[PDB]
């Protein structure tokens, strides 16, 4: 009875390694929150 995942978030940082997250609410097996890698730019 999961609801749909939220859209992935903005990246946690716009320089170097960052992450996005998304969430969903029950009503139920599976996660409630996920993260995924992002990298927008290299910053000196």
């Amino acid at each position: 009875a999961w609801d749909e995942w939220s859209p992935w978030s903005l990246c946690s940082s716009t320089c170097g390694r960052g992450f996005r997250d998304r969430t969903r609410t029950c009503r139920c097996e599976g996660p409630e929150k996920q993260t995924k890698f992002c990298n927008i730019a290299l910053c000196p």
Binding site: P7, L10, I40
Partner: protein, 284 residues
């Protein structure tokens, strides 16, 4: 066979590598068979005409973090297969002759960030139909002229942040049908033409934060049918009825947007336009 300041090897590609060797000029005697040339981190001040002309198979050329003060218009003649050209971090370059990249029909990555560039001259990106990544951030650009990128139909990443761009005219981004990420934050942008993003139906990321925007016309974001990530913070937004179209668009947006902080009126100066009620934006 290999220049004294360099190391040369054949696998995986023929490579002449001489980074950070204190070179003041492109070294003589680079093997004509070179496919990759790494000259970053030196103190090279000039790239004369035909500096790499014999290297017909060259696909990677790194000249970043030098002391470039002049690149001859014919510097890259002969490099018809060049794919990656890194000219970044040459803060005293200031100007690139608008014919410098003509003929580079396989170029897909072009780094020009941190070059002190004052303008993008007419024709600078003419015919670069293969270009995918174009880095122009952290220069001194004061204008985005119409049709500057019109031939870049394969471009997916355009970084323009950290300049002094005061506005986005109607045809600045004409032709950019493949564009994925457009980074325009940290500029002086005070307005975006209503139809400036007409060709950006495939854009997924747009950064406009840290600019001079108080409002966006109703039409500006309408073409952005693929957008997923939008940053609009750190602008002097006015949250009266002039914000209603932006508010309405933000209510329906299915991606992720930054906060859109109200600067005025004062009674709303503690709020995010996205979270306002419709009644706050009634009146016009």
């Amino acid at each position: 066979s290999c220049p004294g300041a360099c190391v040369c090897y054949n696998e995986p590609k023929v490579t002449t590598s001489c980074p950070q060797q204190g070179l003041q000029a492109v070294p003589t005697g680079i093997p004509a068979s070179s496919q990759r040339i790494f000259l970053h981190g030196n103190r090279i001040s000039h790239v004369p005409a035909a500096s790499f002309q014999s290297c017909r198979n060259l696909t990677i050329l790194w000249l970043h973090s030098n002391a470039l003060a002049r690149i001859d218009a014919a510097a890259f003649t002969g490099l018809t297969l060049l794919e990656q050209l890194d000219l970044s971090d040459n803060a005293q370059l200031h100007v690139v002759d608008p014919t410098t990249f003509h003929g580079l029909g396989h170029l897909h990555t072009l780094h020009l960030d941190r070059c002190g560039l004052r303008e993008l001259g007419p024709g600078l990106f003419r015919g670069l139909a293969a270009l995918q990544y174009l880095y122009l951030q952290d220069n001194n650009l004061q204008a985005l002229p119409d049709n500057t990128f019109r031939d870049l139909g394969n471009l997916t990443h355009l970084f323009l942040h950290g300049n002094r761009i005061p506005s986005v005219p109607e045809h600045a981004f004409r032709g950019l049908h493949s564009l994925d990420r457009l980074l325009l934050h940290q500029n002086h942008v005070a307005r975006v033409h209503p139809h400036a993003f007409r060709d950006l139906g495939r854009l997924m990321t747009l950064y406009l934060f840290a600019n001079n925007l108080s409002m966006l016309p109703a039409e500006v974001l309408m073409p952005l049918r693929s957008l997923q990530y939008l940053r609009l913070n750190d602008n002097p937004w006015v949250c009266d009825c002039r914000a209603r179209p932006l508010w309405a668009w933000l209510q329906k947006f299915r991606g992720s947007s930054s906060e859109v902080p109200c600067n005025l009126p004062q009674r709303l100066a503690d709020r995010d336009l996205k979270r306002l009620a419709a009644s706050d934006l009634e009146g016009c």
